[PDB]
From a paper:
Here, we present the biochemical and structural characterization of two CBASS systems, composed of [name] and [name], from Asticcacaulis sp. and [name]. We show that [name] from Asticcacaulis sp. synthesizes 3′,2′-[name] in vitro, and 3′,2′-[name] is the biological signaling molecule that activates [name] for DNA degradation. Each monomer of [name] is composed of the N-terminal HNH domain, the C-terminal [name] domain, and a short flexible linker connecting these two domains. The structures revealed that both [name] form homodimers, resulting from the side-by-side packing of two HNH domains.
To provide molecular insight into the ligand specificity of the [name] domain of [name], we solved the crystal structure of the [name] domain of LlCap5 (LlCap5-[name]) in complex with 3′,2′-[name]. The structures of the [name] domains of LlCap5-[name] and the full-length LlCap5 are essentially the same (rmsd = 0.4 Å). In our structure, 3′,2′-[name] is found at the center of LlCap5-[name]. Employing a similar evolutionary approach to describe the structure of LlCap5-[name], 3′,2′-[name] is bound at the interface of these two CARF-like motifs. Several conserved residues of LlCap5-[name] are involved in the recognition of 3′,2′-[name]. Specifically, the adenine base is stacked between the side chains of I208 and R234, which is further stacked by the side chain of F304. The side chain of R234 also forms a hydrogen bond with the 2′−5′ phosphate linkage. The involvement of the side chain of R234 for both base-stacking and phosphate-hydrogen bonding appears to be only feasible with the 2′−5′ phosphate linkage, indicating R234 is the discriminating residue to distinguish 3′,2′-[name] from 3′,3′-[name]. In addition to R234, the side chain of S274 also hydrogen bonds with the 2′−5′ phosphate linkage, and the free 3′-OH group of the AMP moiety hydrogen bonds with the main-chain carbonyl group of T344. On the other hand, a single residue, R281, is responsible for the recognition of the guanine base.
Author numbering: 122 to 133, 142 to 384
Write the structure that this text describes.
Amino acid sequence: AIKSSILSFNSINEEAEFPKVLLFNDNYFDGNIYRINNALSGIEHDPMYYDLMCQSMKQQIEKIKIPLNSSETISVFAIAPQPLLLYLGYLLNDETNIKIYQRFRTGNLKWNWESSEITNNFYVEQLYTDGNEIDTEVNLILSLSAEISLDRIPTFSNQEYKVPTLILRSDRQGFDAIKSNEDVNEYISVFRNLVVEKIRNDFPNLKCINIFPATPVSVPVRMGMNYQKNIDVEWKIFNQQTNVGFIYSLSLKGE
Ligand SMILES: Nc1nc2c(ncn2[C@@H]2O[C@@H]3COP(=O)(O)O[C@@H]4[C@H](O)[C@@H](COP(=O)(O)O[C@H]3[C@H]2O)O[C@H]4n2cnc3c(N)ncnc32)c(=O)[nH]1
C-alpha cells in the first residue's frame, strides 16, 4: 500500500539513492527494481539509434508487464534523450499508480523533489492568427529548460507552405523549470488542454504534431504517458544534435 517498485532507465549509477527518495514520498521500496538496459550503447552515433533503442525498450517492457502491473506503485527514475523518455512514457502509459521523478543537479538526493507546491507557470504563444480546415501539421516548440529560438526550427520559405507553429514556455526557464510533481501536473494540464486539444480545435484535419523540445526529464516521460493511443494524432519528436540542428527521432502513432 505504501509499497513501490522502482523502474530505472539511464542511457546518457544513482540507483542506491532511489529507495531513500521513495521514503520521502510516502512509499518504501518493495524489492522489485526493473532496470531498462541501454542495449545499443556504442551505436549512439548512427541514424538507426532511435529505431533500435525503441525496439529494445518495447521488448524489455513487454516482458515485465505482468510484474509491472502487479505493483502497488511504480516509481520511475529515467534519464535519456528526450525522444526515448517520450517513448518510455508511451510504453508505461499509465498515469495512475506511476510516479515520475525529476533529476536535479544539486542536493542530498538528486532525484527528490525540490518543492511540494507549484513553483512555475506554463503558457502558450501561437504564431498564427486563425485555424483552418486545410493544414494537417503543426510545429510545437517546448521551451522549458531553455528558449529555443525560431531560427532553429526548419521552416518553409514560401507562405503557402509555412507550418502553423505554437510555443509552450514557462515563466522560469532553465534546468529547474520543474521543481515539484505539482509543477509537472500543471505542465501536463496546459499541454493537454491548451496545446494538444487546442491545436485540433483550430485545425480539425490535423494529422501530425512536430515537437521540438528543450525540457527536463520528467516532462517527456509524462507526455508519453499522456498520449491517447489510436485517439491522438501522430506526435513526431525531433532532437537537437550537435552541428546538425533538430533531426527527426521517432513518432508516437496510432495503429
Ligand atoms: N540548455 C539547452 N538545451 C537544449 C536546447 N535545445 C534543446 N535542448 C535539449 O533539451 C535538453 C535540456 O537539458 P535538461 O538538462 O534540462 O534535460 C535533459 C533532457 O531531459 C534529458 C536528455 O538530455 P539532452 O539530450 O542533452 O537534451 C537537452 C538539450 O540538448 O536529460 C536531461 N539531462 C541531461 N543532463 C542532465 C543532468 N546532469 N541532470 C539532470 N537532467 C539532465 C537549448 O537551446 N539549450
